[PDB]
Structure 1
């Protein structure tokens, strides 16, 4: 995709902390909006290359020609997309006039994403999920994205990280408008329940580490392994993911190894009100520790009180950390084998040892209604079915067009981001 300047591109500044054994030091940073939310149009005019959920027939005949004829434009972060930063805080608004949701990446500079090496290090952040009802997701995660957005590998990309290009995940999303310096007009199917999205022929795969998938009702910690650690282009049903005839035909794991305190047995640990150990009406600190083995440790901090991850009994397993033993026990108890099929913890440990881009987003589910996070899932399973109940929300809740009209002023606030070796983020 090319670059147009019908509107200037200014990344909202966000400060984070880099920690070491002797202290934590402030770092200058900024966030960039994903390329899919941007206005794609002709390089020489105001003619849309993509309007609604249908591509331009004259400007985008094929994938390669479209990228030559079309440009990405600057984004009004506050006015159009409702994204504001104030020192430590990054605030994302669910609904803005003519817009829903957002996805942003932390940057080292304007030209490059900020790459994190999780192996041997820990990640800490404060989050406000009080305004996040059922059907929404305040997501904070890491993905194996190219630091430059793929400008080095693909010459068709002239935008780069400066305009939020080159997104990848384990779902291998085919909904991306631009992949590898090429458009996705070929084989593009408009969405039936979304007047702004669609499904193309190609997709984008990379290792995904979901540190935070949460609302006021439930929170989940999920590692996703891919056969290819870095970014690769997928083709058709081969990529897999939620939107394909086959979900487990890709090179990646869509399901993942997930740790949901509610799903594992504890229904009074995370929720709204004094009753829960972690009151979601109030903000909390979430610390995620990554060992060199790939094992994932976790503790929370709310109002000065440290909460260890609650011990869960899954089959023969007993503990509070994500490891091969738990991930195998969860697969046997609840069902599915997708995590270990793509290499498991040993495969995604390669992603921890490599660079991954920090992603902070707010979105609703147009496919499942977020029932996989905060409700009983799937529909074909009963409340009695092991690992079916993941939250306390209704099976009717989460409908995108319902929650957009009901709670348009929903928001998630990410603040106090710290990164450093294990045991360094807490104080000094």
Structure 2
């Protein structure tokens, strides 16, 4: 894709902190950029649509390569069009703004380069306000093994780059992306039957994904997802796997992950409105990526979680599922959880924590987003899923929401002013970001 010129691009600023020891942090002057897929795609000459609703113009885009040459990703009016604002260390993402739904943003090191985090033997903390996230919404903060430059050095017809939010990948091998690897996705494009703005093409973009935070005011999950190749790679067709291929298990990434949602793990009192972590008020989420020998070059062995609210430091609750022990993600936990829930162990099939850790060693990009779910209504996060199962069977119940909740047309109509706000990002050695 070309770099658009109809609307100017300026990346909202966002501060965050690097910590060297508890209480000892310094400020980084970051910025964020909107993902390419939210942008208007305009022909470079006439400033007319290359993509309208969910179909492509056949003159500008007769094939994938020609489309990338003829079409540009426009700049973004972050607040006015996308409902994205920032102030200090805070980033607020609104749900519905005009015809726009949600957003996905990346943290930048500079105007052409995503910030790369090396998570092994480190800790990441942030504050979040999920009080205005009802059933069906997901404010997600997570890491993916994107290229720092958004693909530009590999793909000459990507002239837009990280400056325009190119290069996304995740463990779903997303095929909804209009541009992957310097080519459009017009060949094989199939408009979504239930989303006027989206479709699915033949190409998908795979990479490992560390879902630090997928949450609303009802439930949260922390979930690593390994891929056979840790970093970004293109897939084609059904063999992409992931949620929007015919068979989610046909590809090279684990679409399910090894998840810890305290409600799903048998403690419904822990997280939610008025609960031990009270989602009606902001709180701090700390995540630690421990290695087997406690050094930077060890193998990822354990992912731990702490919350801080009202200055009280609260560990993740223990699993209360028979057969599944502890409050952290480890190989043993993950093997046991899949067995107890009767879920296929795709996590182990794609290399588990060893392959997640390899992706972490490659470096990962921070993503902050807000979305609703045109495949499964977020029921996997906050309801009983699948909806035909007995909610008392271990693994089925994930939150309090009814099984008819989360339909996009309902939540976009009923909760347009919902939002998520992320703030006070801190990163550093284990125990450096909070009072351990």
Partner SS, residue 212 of structure 1: strand
Alignment length (residue pairs): 426
Could you tell me how far 1:287 is from its partner in structure 2? Answer: 0.1
Aligned counterpart, 2:210: 209
Could you tell me how far 1:366 is from its partner in structure 2? Answer: 0.6
Matched, 1:183 2:184: yes
> CA deviation digits over 1:204-255, x for unaligned, max 9?
0000000000000000000000000011000000110111111101100000
Contact 2:242 2:251 in 1 (8 A): yes
Contact 1:299 1:307 in 2 (8 A): yes
Contact 2:4 2:160 in 1 (8 A): no
Aligned counterpart, 2:8: 8
Contact 1:315 1:329 in 2 (8 A): no
Aligned counterpart, 1:198: 199
> CA deviation digits over 1:312-363, x for unaligned, max 9?
1444442111000000001100121111110111111111222100000000
Matched, 1:424 2:423: no
| 1:334 alignment partner, one of 341, 345, 351 | 341
Could you tell me how far 1:386 is from its partner in structure 2? Answer: 1.7
Could you tell me how far 1:259 is from its partner in structure 2? Answer: 0.1
Whole-Å separation in 2 of the counterparts to 1:292 and 1:63: 42
Aligned counterpart, 1:263: 264
Whole-Å separation in 1 of the counterparts to 2:229 and 2:388: 32
Aligned counterpart, 2:296: none
Aligned counterpart, 2:20: 20
Whole-Å separation in 2 of the counterparts to 1:310 and 1:354: 31
Whole-Å separation in 1 of the counterparts to 2:243 and 2:388: 17
Partner SS, residue 107 of structure 2: strand
Aligned counterpart, 1:278: 277
> CA deviation digits over 1:64-92, x for unaligned, max 9?
11000101111000000000000011000
Q: Which runs of 5+ in 1 are unaligned?
A: none
Could you tell me how far 1:427 is from its partner in structure 2? Answer: 5.9
Whole-Å separation in 2 of the counterparts to 1:160 and 1:309: 38
Matched, 1:172 2:191: no
Q: Which runs of 5+ in 2 are unaligned?
A: 293-299
Aligned counterpart, 1:152: 153
Aligned counterpart, 1:225: 226
| 2:313 alignment partner, one of 290, 306, 309 | 306
Contact 2:266 2:321 in 1 (8 A): no
Could you tell me how far 1:380 is from its partner in structure 2? Answer: 3.1
Instruction: Supply the RMSD in Å over aligned alpha carbons.
Output: 1.1
| 2:303 alignment partner, one of 280, 291, 296 | 296
Aligned counterpart, 1:139: 140
Distance 1:109 1:12, change over 3 A: same
Q: TM-score, normalised by structure 2?
A: 0.96
Whole-Å separation in 1 of the counterparts to 2:402 and 2:147: 39
Could you tell me how far 1:424 is from its partner in structure 2? Answer: 0.6
Contact 2:126 2:284 in 1 (8 A): yes
Contact 1:134 1:215 in 2 (8 A): yes
Could you tell me how far 1:162 is from its partner in structure 2? Answer: 0.2
Could you tell me how far 1:382 is from its partner in structure 2? Answer: 1.4
Distance 1:300 1:36, change over 3 A: same
Aligned counterpart, 1:412: 420
Contact 1:136 1:215 in 2 (8 A): yes
Contact 1:159 1:165 in 2 (8 A): yes
**More displaced 10-residue stretch of structure 1: 334-343 or 133-142:** 334-343
| 1:364 alignment partner, one of 372, 376, 383 | 372
Whole-Å separation in 1 of the counterparts to 2:73 and 2:392: 49
Whole-Å separation in 2 of the counterparts to 1:174 and 1:354: 23
Whole-Å separation in 2 of the counterparts to 1:192 and 1:184: 17
> CA deviation digits over 1:13-66, x for unaligned, max 9?
000000112710010000000001101010111221101000111100111110
Aligned counterpart, 1:93: 94
Partner SS, residue 5 of structure 1: coil
Partner SS, residue 113 of structure 2: coil
Could you tell me how far 1:292 is from its partner in structure 2? Answer: 1.9
Q: TM-score, normalised by structure 1?
A: 0.98
Contact 2:324 2:340 in 1 (8 A): no
Could you tell me how far 1:308 is from its partner in structure 2? Answer: 0.5
Whole-Å separation in 1 of the counterparts to 2:425 and 2:181: 30
